[model samples]
Target chain A: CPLMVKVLDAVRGSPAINVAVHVFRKAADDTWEPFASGKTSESGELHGLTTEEEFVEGIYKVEIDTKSYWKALGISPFHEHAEVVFTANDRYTIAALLSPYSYSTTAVVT
Target chain B: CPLMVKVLDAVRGSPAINVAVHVFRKAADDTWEPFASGKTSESGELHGLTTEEEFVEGIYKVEIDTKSYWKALGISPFHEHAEVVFTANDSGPRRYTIAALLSPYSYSTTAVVTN
Candidate 1:
């Protein structure tokens, strides 16, 4: 099954921000590979990337470019980056929580 | 190993929002159990809930309360909730990504961790 991933910025009092997403997967040999790449939209959403072949079933890691996203706004972020690691079972829905200091991720598989 | 999860809100022109995280795990018998519960902080982060016993291994699901979080600010969200499914394979240290229109979630586990 394909996995559906969503990224959100729910920070109050901040402008709509842009973020870079890098998806990495653990290979059969216990190594990692860069898979999918994307960015947040004006509405603060990025959707429908299932067409990418790299989003297969396995263990994957996602990296968020927090520093550049914030630096563009002339604001300084306490953390340089945000990372999330998860497995894509046969399910299809995933969401991420974004804030200045912290973030959260949730997944539902079918 | 233990699993660490974080939540973030990166919407511009939006206020710092609050979130409720419910961790559910699948039992040996194929049943689901509610494990740990948490909320995002003022800084948009939720950290250090390792003391809870519910964060075991196996297949797990996380649900987000998006409607209420946006309703409080008089905004309508296209999504009511966001979910992710991942296995915790014995490593620590997990992080999540947050944006307005799109959101990305991630996790890392140690050997002691389960699903």
Candidate 2:
């Protein structure tokens, strides 16, 4: 696995389960093309988003559907979604702290 | 100014100066439109990115260009940028803090809000 995401709900102080995640790669033509997509598990993790072979050196974007996560819990969120855009030349793990009013993202790269 | 960002370099253990920061707001059509942008100052803070009158209840993204900050020092970074996103609906003048800790290969961020 070359890519992974971990989401924690700051308000609930628990793993953010069932949050939608979408991965997109920058195409040669400069448009974003869908690469992969998944939902966070009970443990708040989505691993193996892409294989090393397919995850070549390029720009990638991980879009998290944060609005739905808060809305599902009867809370109104501010952002439509949360996205982490970065240049991927190594294995990356995104750790995110999510709240109805705020969210933070960090990355561990190898 | 209604919003601000503070950046610290974990490796250097000091304030990160001149780091570029960009703010984007979600539009009516669900697209992220540019709202405000600035660079960190000598104190590692970008203050007054926007006025309270313009910062209504909405979803906003604050992106810090960490890559360039590290690369300028002749080191390579893993992440292209660091982003903080959240909703703002405060009727009063609420202060929001977008704090980030950055390293060459890892990063962490947290948010603080005060009314």
Candidate 3:
């Protein structure tokens, strides 16, 4: 299952570029394991995150390395990383809305 | 440790009121276990969050139920909840800053909770 992700500035309604995104799975050892990572394109979109791997069941987390993104934009850093957790089994589209002062993620399963 | 947290409207610099806050410890089972909870006062301050409990080391999480706060202000819902993760131990100020900046759809806590 591919995870389609898009990030945008909630306040200005603009695309957020150079934002680093990573997927992590809570392993049986109870540690956060990195599954995949990619940077958002100019359009603030990154699709097919699961293209190289098969779908796995259980808890999964999406971590946006917000530090670099905010630093590049010359803004204050509120959160170290934007983390969104969800259960995985099939395809999904995860939309991350980023504000300099706040952030949110909405997921749709298919 | 008594934690001091403040919620504020980032855009307008106004204090956020009635925002519910909760702290949790990540148990060995990997489930977030509730440690404590309290709502912001009229001044948007929640001091003494750790008043009733002893300090424990490990992962701690703060969950903010933002739905009701935004509803009272007649704003669109952005996040169903806001959760912040941090490590807890001995007593200190433990202050946090929150930003509720959504205009008709925006959302606070005080802390540089990057880790």
Q: Model 2's DockQ?
A: 0.49
Range of the 10 consecutive residues with the lowest summed lDDT in candidate 2 chain A: A101-110
Candidate 2 vs candidate 3: the lDDT winner is 2
Question: Model 1, A28-53: lDDT tens per residue?
Answer: 99777877767867655556545546
* Residues B1-110, model 2: lDDT tens digits: 56889999888889999999999998999898999999999989999899878888887889999999999889888778888777776455577888888887666666
Question: In CAPRI terms, where does candidate 3 land?
Answer: incorrect
- Per-residue lDDT, model 1, residue A22, is 74
Q: Show pairs that collide, candidate 2.
A: A78-B87
lDDT of each: 0.53, 0.85, 0.67
- The number of the candidate with the highest lDDT is 2
lDDT, model 2, position B2: 67
> Per-residue alpha-carbon lDDT of model 2 for A10-109, expressed as tens digits?
9878999999999999999988899999999999999978888899988999999998999999997666688888887646788888877667777877
Error of 1 at B20 (Å): 24
* Local error of candidate 2 at residue A54 (angstroms): 2.3
Compute the lDDT of residue A54 as modeled in candidate 2: 94
Per-residue lDDT of candidate 3, residues A20-101 (tens digit): 8998888999788888789999999887677635556767777787767877778765566776665564367777777654
Mark the regions of model 3 whose C-alpha exceeds 4 Å error after superposition: B1-47, B50-61, B64-82, B85-115
The global Cα lDDT (0 to 1) of model 3 is 0.67
